[model samples]
Target chain A: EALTKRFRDITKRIDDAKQKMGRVMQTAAFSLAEVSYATGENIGYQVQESVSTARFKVRARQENVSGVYLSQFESYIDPEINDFRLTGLGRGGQQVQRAKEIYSRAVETLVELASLQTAFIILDEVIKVTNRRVNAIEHVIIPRTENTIAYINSELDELDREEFYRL
Target chain B: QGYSLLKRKSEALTKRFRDITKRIDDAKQKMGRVMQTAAFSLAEVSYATGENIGYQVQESVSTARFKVRARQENVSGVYLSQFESYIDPEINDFRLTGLGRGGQQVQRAKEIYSRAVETLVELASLQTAFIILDEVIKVTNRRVNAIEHVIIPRTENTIAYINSELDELDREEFYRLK
Candidate 1:
């Protein structure tokens, strides 16, 4: 009983963290989009020679990034590498370290992308892999935990009943 | 065991389970939206890629958007029999000289390709992160449902059984005492 209660408390805390990450991801997206000048335009629309006439946004600075939520999962389980200061410009010490991690990861991805002749195709593969991971957690693993804990409680009760009947 | 302590603990745990489940739901719902956004965004990119690689041009004179030709580029050394018009048909023939445009065009195209690649990579990473997060969410949700709908109730049932059976045992002991 004690253990079960403990688990419940812990999982609840974890869930709170998980919910926070979703908001963080959203905030990161807004950060990426809010830029005044797109650091990189798919077509150098900035250059006159490129025929595509799609206007693109560029990266820019804004004051408030309070929208960025801290990821509870990332902090508790895996510190997700996030570079886009979707949370805001700076945080000291641990926060700063995390921000650097984000920078490197995002930059590494950009470099890898730029190197590929078929970047669009490569990115497609990467995106596919990511989508799969997101789906599995949402559909499968969490449900399994729900099942296991339920089973545990049942087994624990059955043990108590057998003991009572023996007496 | 006192019913209050164990039961209260059970209640607290149940509440926690419910809270976690709600969080998982929130994440799942948000991700569903992101999936749609990503699909549309990528589709637009594919369209852009398709056109980007196949730039149509005449080596001698540029075809205007107003009038483009669908004839063979390989017929009789690439000049048109129909007199090239700068105004009506808008096929301008100017002998561009000096600094030249071919090398510059190549450089500019390369730049565009780089930009496209960068965007693709970032988007890909975003997708990857989404997947890992998804797994974690699923596992957590499972635990919540297990506790809420299955575990707690079973525990409650067991507690009841124990309480009743223990009463019977005490009554038997009383009879033996008599």
Candidate 2:
């Protein structure tokens, strides 16, 4: 009984998490598009070492949920201080500086988004495996147990009738 | 044995579920601030760059410089789908983008936005996992409820009834002997 109750609570919690993460991803994607439009450049470019000294790192922690090990992800920023040699060379240094700051915020949001995504994937896998176990118990194991019990009772009843007739 | 095993599984999932719930709450709060900055960044870019740069970017790129590679991670017995963002080092499609005008700003925005893309891919993977987990958890809970409330109780009741019937039969035989 307690076990089932806990399962229910977990299910509800997972649903809530799913909805919240969904919203966050949506906003991040929108921001990505906005930046792309403003800068007239493909913001989706995967490599940036040719342009800046920023590195994004993701770390995973293997957490045990019961006997199962689930993976949780965290994002880290490793930034190197390099000189922007072309700052004054650009036509609008002031406006460019402001844009750079804003874009940095967008990047941070995406980093967080990525961490959530990795955790989400791992949880999904765990849930599916759990569901399969639940199904086996409900459909296969329980029914088989009931059948055995019924067979035992019938055999006992037959023995009682035979004894009655013998007496 | 199956009942005990399943009970343990349910408990474990519940624990992990609680952890995810807390994370979602934190992510939601952080989202507002991040989104605000992104929007402000866009406004600044627009003010600095004047008009649409999308057309120029579109014209310049032949292939995707940013790509996502799909991978699978095994958690217990389950296999989770994961996506990784891969950047081709040789592809410098955006190299000449801001060279003529706001070169420095354009380059900086590109760098930050690239970082954003990486994060987006990671976020996408998590969201996908979240949706799958939500569904699986619901199914698991339902099964647990069915087994706990209906199956176990009914079986126990049947066993008790059978035992009582056997006892009554035993008394009948003894009375006849007396």
Candidate 3:
């Protein structure tokens, strides 16, 4: 009885944590949407040129959560790499400079978004596996034990009553 | 014993979940402000540079100066993938872009946008951890509940019945002796 009480307490705490994460995800989705919209509006133009030589490199680090290891990603720009100088000197120059600054920022945002999105997908898979483990323990293992215990108890009772009658 | 082990795992996961929740809240708030500022900066750029600059920038860039790399973080037993961004040190693809006009404004916009991106990366990592923890917690809780409500009670009941039968037998033996 005492053991069961303690189990209930642990389960309750886990449930509370789940609820909190759900709420946080809801807010996160909203933030993601905002990021998407801002990115699209600011830098959605199509590239007319062929693929650039520049590329991104992906690296990993391990984070420990309760003995589980989750993979976190870091993006790197290839050290090797454009030129469009010389046209602006008058009104167009000032305007071009302002536009350049804003567009540069927008591009950076897109890069960051890409990094987070990759991480999101990886985490999704991890959750799926964890769910399966939990289900197997709950639905399969627990019930089998319960059935076995019940059968043993009935047998014990039958033997006890028989001995009592004989006496 | 197995049940106790799972309980510990659940507790550890829950602690991590709470930590992630706090981070997500902070990241989201920061995102709100950073994104707003970025949008305003975009507007100023448009007003200063005219409408077709997007196309010009796109046409001029032959290679990407900014890029992302992916990595892994281990939370509990799960492997969560995360990404980071870096700029090429040698790439000057945009060097000539603002050279003609609005140079100061362009530089300012670039800095602000970079900050926005950093905030986003932080938020994304937190959000991913948050999601994984949520599902894992649910599974852990269900298992805990099943053990507590079903297995424990049934076992306890069986034990009680066995004890009662043994007691009854003791009475029978006493009466027989009398």
**lDDT per residue (tens digit) for residues B51-95 in model 2:** 456666767778777999998865434456778888887777565
Ranking by lDDT: 2, 3, 1
Considering the two chains of model 2, state its CAPRI-style docking category.
incorrect
Query: Which numbered prediction scores highest in lDDT against the true structure?
Result: 2
Using lDDT as the yardstick, the better of models 1 and 3 is: 3
Q: lDDT of candidate 2 vs native?
A: 0.51
Off by over 4 Å in 3: A1-167, B1-16, B48-53, B72-82, B93-102, B119-132, B160-178
Task: Kindly list the interface RMSD, in angstroms, of each predicted candidate in the order they appear.
Answer: 32.8, 37.2, 36.7
TM-score of chain B of each: 0.38, 0.63, 0.63
Candidate 3 lDDT tens digits, B1-178? 3555566756765665565455455445555655565556556666776644456567778776777777886644556667687878787845525343565555655665665665455445445544654775775766556545654454344334433443443343334221
Off by over 4 Å in 2: A1-167, B1-9, B28-36, B72-77, B93-106, B125-136, B163-178
For residue B153, model 1's alpha carbon misses the true position, in angstroms, by 1.5
Q: What is the two-chain DockQ of model 1? A: 0.01
